Structures are given as structure tokens and as C-alpha cells.
Design an enzyme around this catalytic site. Structure first.
Site, short mmCIF file in Angstrom:
data_model
loop_
_atom_site.label_atom_id
_atom_site.label_comp_id
_atom_site.label_asym_id
_atom_site.label_seq_id
_atom_site.Cartn_x
_atom_site.Cartn_y
_atom_site.Cartn_z
N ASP A 9 0.87 -1.17 0.00
CA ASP A 9 0.00 0.00 0.00
C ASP A 9 0.91 1.22 0.00
O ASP A 9 2.07 1.13 0.38
CB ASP A 9 -0.86 0.03 1.26
CG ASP A 9 -1.74 1.27 1.33
OD1 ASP A 9 -1.93 1.81 2.45
OD2 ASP A 9 -2.24 1.71 0.27
N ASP A 11 -0.23 5.25 0.62
CA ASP A 11 -0.58 6.21 1.67
C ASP A 11 -0.81 5.53 3.03
O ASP A 11 -1.47 4.50 3.12
CB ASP A 11 -1.82 7.01 1.26
CG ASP A 11 -2.10 8.19 2.20
OD1 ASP A 11 -1.18 8.99 2.47
OD2 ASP A 11 -3.26 8.32 2.65
#
Ligand SMILES: [Mg+2]
Length: 255
Positions: A9, A11
Site C-alpha cells: 500500500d 498512503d
């Protein structure tokens, strides 16, 4: 190292908003040093793949290839092409999203498009919503890029793609096809990218409902870093726990 590949991932995991997360950076460097195949997979369509790369290199000391940045936009265009309906479309979203849609074989049609693609549009307004509604009511294939109900900005948790999408859902009474995490659509195309067996793969994220559940629901080992959305206080009390949990990526190594 039972894990041969890494789905990461962006952010809240490798960085936080406009802020750095040194550990997350070191984590990527190790993965690079160690020669391990990795794939960044994000739901944010407001920023193009190449734009991400740029951001990573100029802001978070990560110099990564373009092929390693898998955005929900790519999964959506892939899907559209897979389904093969006629190439007409109406889009609600940022320029990048639209630029790619038409860069592929899709021409815009405001009245009777085969597809209606909805992603976050920082400037969405009534007219765009009404145009989308009519199109979906007339039968267009309703696609939601990502389910996220909120998007964290340096201003707070503002409405995310999901909220915009929900508005059109309850206004057309037509359930959309979600592309992004934690849906199988993007995850399949991601597992396919690395071409590795889910057994020897692991998804890393900061969000349980999107990142973590992306592995659970799709049979992929998970690592949760409580540096973002899901807070440590709530690690114990989640539905199906994450394969591995950690407060910082600096607690992960060889085996
Ligand atoms: Mg995140």
C-alpha cells in the site's frame, strides 16, 4: 523469507500524506537491495502511475520503475477491456483517469454510454452527478473505481470515491462493480502481475477494510502496519485478524 513477493500500500504505509515514514522507505530499499519482486497497489485514481513514481522519487527517496506502480485506474481499464462492451463511456473523476480511459479505446458519450466509470473528482458537482445518473438509468455498466468512503487530506477525512459512488447508487438503485481494494478484480490483476502464488505473497497496508481484507477475502497473507487508518488500540477486535501485525515496518526481516 517464506514470502517471495510483496504487494504494498502507499498512503499511510510507505508515507503519510505529505509526511515521511522513514521505516517504510527503508523497507522498500531492503526489498530492492534484497532483489525481491514488489508491486505498489493503490486505490487513489486522482494521481497517475507515472505521477506516483515522481512523487516517490522526489519526496520519499524511493526510485522505483513504472511497472511497479499499480493504480486502481489500471485495474479499471483492464476490466473494461476484459468485458468488451462497446467503447463509449461517461466518467466522473480527475483528468488522469479520463486521459487514460480515452487513451485506451473509449470515446466519451454523455447520453447513452456502455460504461459509466466513477472515481474521486475533487471538483465533482451536480451536473456531473445528474449526467451520470441518467446514463446509468439508461442501462450503462456502472463501475466504481474504489470503495473508500473517505480520503485523508492535510485537511481531514473528506468524502472519498465511495461516497460519490454511493450517491449515484441510491439515485439509480443500481449496485456498482467495485474495482479497487479489497475487491478481487484489482487483486487478481495484481497477483497476476507478479506471477507468483498467493501462498508465497503478502499484502502490506495500514487499512484493515481495504488493504488487510484485500488479502483475507482473496487468500493472501497479510501484514498490517498500524501507522495509518487502523489504530493499534483496535488490532484486537477485528473480524479475521491479519497474518502479521506490527507497529512499524522496522519489525520485519528475513524470516
Ligand atoms: Mg492507505
Amino acid at each position: 523469507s517464506l514470502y517471495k513477493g510483496y504487494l504494498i500500500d502507499l498512503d499511510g504505509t510507505i508515507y503519510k500524506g505529505k509526511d515521511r515514514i522513514p521505516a517504510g522507505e527503508t523497507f522498500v530499499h531492503e526489498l530492492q537491495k534484497r532483489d525481491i519482486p514488489y508491486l505498489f497497489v493503490t486505490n487513489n485514481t486522482t494521481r497517475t502511475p507515472e505521477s506516483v513514481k515522481e512523487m516517490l522519487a522526489q519526496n520519499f527517496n524511493i526510485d522505483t520503475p513504472l511497472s511497479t506502480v499499480y493504480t486502481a485506474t489500471l485495474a479499471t481499464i483492464d476490466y473494461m477491456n476484459d468485458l468488451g462492451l462497446e467503447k463509449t463511456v461517461y466518467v466522473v473523476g480527475e483528468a488522469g483517469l479520463k486521459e487514460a480511459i480515452k487513451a485506451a479505446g473509449y470515446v466519451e458519450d454523455k447520453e447513452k454510454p456502455a460504461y459509466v466509470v466513477v472515481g474521486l473528482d475533487w471538483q465533482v458537482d451536480y451536473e456531473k452527478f445528474a449526467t451520470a445518473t441518467l446514463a446509468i438509468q439508461k442501462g450503462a455498466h456502472f463501475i466504481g473505481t474504489n470503495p473508500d468512503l473517505n480520503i485523508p487530506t492535510e485537511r481531514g477525512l473528506l468524502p472519498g470515491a465511495g461516497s460519490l459512488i454511493t450517491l449515484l447508487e441510491v439515485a439509480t438503485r443500481v449496485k456498482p462493480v467495485y474495482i479497487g481494494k479489497p475487491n478481487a478484480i484489482i487483486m487478481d490483476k495484481a497477483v497476476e502481475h507478479l506471477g507468483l502464488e498467493r501462498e508465497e505473497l503478502i499484502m502490506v497496508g495500514d487499512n484493515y477494510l481495504t488493504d488487510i481484507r484485500a488479502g483475507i477475502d482473496n487468500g493472501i497473507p497479510t501484514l498490517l502496519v498500524t501507522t495509518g487508518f487502523t489504530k493499534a488500540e483496535e488490532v484486537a477486535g477485528l473480524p479475521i485478524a491479519p497474518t502479521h501485525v506490527v507497529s512499524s515496518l522496522a519489525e520485519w526481516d528475513f524470516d
